[PDB]
Structure formats: structure tokens, C-alpha cells
Design a protein around this ligand. Sequence first.
Ligand SMILES: Nc1ncc2ccccc2n1
Length: 172
Amino acid sequence: VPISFVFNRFPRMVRDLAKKMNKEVNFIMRGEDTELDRTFVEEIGEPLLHLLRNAIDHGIEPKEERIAKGKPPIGTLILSARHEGNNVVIEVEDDGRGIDKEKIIRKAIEKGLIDESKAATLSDQEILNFLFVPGFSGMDVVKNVVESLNGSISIESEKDKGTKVTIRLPLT
Ligand SMILES: Nc1ncc2ccccc2n1
């Protein structure tokens, strides 16, 4: 099917969550005509809804805070799909407050998953990959579904700039 069968549900879910959270959100959908196998279409909805929720709750800041930080007042959330070879790539991007890598390291140390000495040299991707650890605090459940579809997921984020989650699905 076109992924529009999934993506057409999201503007409703996104305004509803924005109203509940007192966030002003500019939601943009691109690539909705991108076609993929029915099994992916019937399963990819729940993971995507989780990522959109995360963007609106934890990423986009309220307008007053964005103005105070010198950002464009209304936060933007972009959900896109495209073909890459025989794969489909789906991205959820926001221009919100990002993921705080220092907080992740602190939590990791508190949980005994790494010591201070080793935290100093972790890469960005190694740090963000703690988010997929079960119970870390979720992104594990999103990963579980994606992996069940033989997909991969990655996260890029920077503090104050925003977050991009990318899901790559096979042709299957
Ligand atoms: N999009 C987004 N933005 C901030 C987050 C902060 C914590 C965890 C997930 C997040 N995801």
C-alpha cells in the first residue's frame, strides 16, 4: 500500500497530543505516496506514533520557551518516507530541545552500565544507543518492532537543535 494508509491518521493524533500538551506544532508530512508491503504498513504505525509522541512531549518546547531561546516560535515536526534502493526510509525530525547526552551518561553510570572513565571517550552514537537498552527510559519497544520487520533504526540528536529518528525497512 501507499504508506498514506498509516500517515493519514497522524495529523489528527498530532494536533490531539499538541492540544493536550499545550504545544504549538507545525506538522509536515512528505513522501506519503511511498509504497511498501502490506505487512510493513500494518505494523509500522505503532512505532511511528511513539516517535511522534516523543517529539511533541519531550522534544518541541512550548512557544514561550522557544521565543526565549531565540528559536522560531512554533516547533516543527516532519514525518517523511522515501525509497532508497530496495529499502524504504522513514524519518521523524523535530527542531525541539534534543536529547541531553550528558543526562544519558549520568543515568548510565547510575545504572552501573559504564564507569566515568569510559564515558569520556564514547561516541555520539554509542551514547544515544543507551536509549535502546530495555528500561533505560520506551525506545526499546520501538526498536523491537522495527527489528521484527527486519529493519534498523538510528537516532541523531543535539541539545537545543532537535532530533532525527530514521527507520530503514527492507523490501520483504
Ligand atoms: N524527539 C525526541 N526529543 C527529545 C527526546 C528526549 C528524550 C527521549 C526521546 C526524545 N525524542
